[PDB]
Amino acid sequence: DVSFRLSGADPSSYGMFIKDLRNALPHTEKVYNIPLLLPSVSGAGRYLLMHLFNYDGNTITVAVDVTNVYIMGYLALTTSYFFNEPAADLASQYVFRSARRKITLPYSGNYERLQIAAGKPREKIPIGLPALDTAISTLLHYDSTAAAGALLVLIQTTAEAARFKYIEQQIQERAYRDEVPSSATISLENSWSGLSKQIQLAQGNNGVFRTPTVLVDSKGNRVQITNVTSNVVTSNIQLLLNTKNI
């Protein structure tokens, strides 16, 4: 398991937790030096448990699918909560079985279903460590509407941060003050799948992408990614979604 506590948390411990989060996911091959996520894992081992503690010390345990880094659900005291999606339902057969009751959310974990449930896009939802403390707090007590938004904060603080160093960096700048995500952040989140595909396809195309990826950069400008020499591939992306899942 991996853990993070917001009490006493700073850019340092956050980075360490994100480093752990990354190291917890297994892989057998690296593509252009980037861990390649497995096509699939069978049974309970398919899920990674993250113990998160808010500033007061309360905790929720989040189950993550180690093949894609998708959040399946979490445990709040003695109640389990899982998205309304096949994968999560499957996940419920293995994790938090001893919870006293199981609640299925009214939506899947997809960014689009989450934004609807929440009544606003990620664009306008401030993130950072403080925001992650709010999120943990919200999920301790069931509220599907407040949860959608806390869940959008959680996904980005943790899964997207493991996925991209840049996003991990974005969150460390927000260690003591939340801020809506830069568009480069939303761009990267939206492009993880495609970038993972083209990184793997480049492998026998001499590091050239079969199809270029369009991103938005730091300065907020439209940019094309055509091959593995881009900083995005050399520095940024830290985990790759196996094409066997794309």
Ligand X SMILES: OC[C@H]1O[C@@H](O[C@H]2[C@H](O)[C@@H](O)[C@H](O)O[C@@H]2CO)[C@H](O)[C@@H](O)[C@H]1O
Ligand Y SMILES: *[C@@H]1O[C@H](CO)[C@@H](OC2O[C@H](CO)[C@@H](O)[C@H](O)[C@H]2NC(C)=O)[C@H](O)[C@H]1NC(C)=O
**85: annotated active-site residue:** no
**For residue 34, which of 245, 242, 246, 244 has the smallest C-alpha distance?**
242
Number of H helices, E strands in the chain: 9, 10
> What is the nearest approach in angstroms of ligand Y to the Cβ of residue 170?
22
**For residue 76, which of 18, 141, 19 has the smallest C-alpha distance?**
141
DSSP state of 104: E
Under 8 Å between Cβ of 227 and 178: no
Residue 195 interacts with ligand X (CB under 6 A)? no
Residue 55 interacts with ligand X (CB under 6 A)? no
Taking the least distance from each CB to ligand Y, the nearer of 77 and 214 is 214
> What is the nearest approach in angstroms of ligand Y to the Cβ of residue 192?
19
Taking the least distance from each CB to ligand Y, the nearer of 38 and 184 is 184
Q: Quick one: which segment of 45-53, 109-117, 118-126, 196-204 binds ligand X (CB under 6 A)?
A: 109-117
Residue 155 interacts with ligand X (CB under 6 A)? yes
Binder of ligand Y out of 40, 110, 205, 229 (CB under 6 A): 229
Residue 73 interacts with ligand X (CB under 6 A)? no
Residue 85 interacts with ligand X (CB under 6 A)? yes
Residue 227 interacts with ligand Y (CB under 6 A)? yes
Burial of 13 (0-12, 13-18, 19+ CB in 10 A): middle
Residue 226 interacts with ligand Y (CB under 6 A)? yes
Q: List C-alpha distances in Å: 160 to 20, 143, 149.
A: 14, 24, 15
Under 8 Å between Cβ of 65 and 73: no
Q: At what angle do helices 165-173 and 11-24 cross, to 10 degrees?
A: 150
> Would strands 59-65 and 47-53 be described as parallel, antiparallel, or unpaired?
antiparallel
> What is the nearest approach in angstroms of ligand X to the Cβ of residue 179?
20
**Type of residue at 33:** N
Taking the least distance from each CB to ligand Y, the nearer of 129 and 232 is 232
Residue 170 interacts with ligand Y (CB under 6 A)? no
Catalytic: which of 29, 85, 112, 160?
Answer: 160
Residues with a catalytic annotation lie at 160
Binding site for ligand X (CB under 6 A): 70-71, 85, 108-111, 155, 159
Binding site for ligand Y (CB under 6 A): 208, 226-227, 229-230
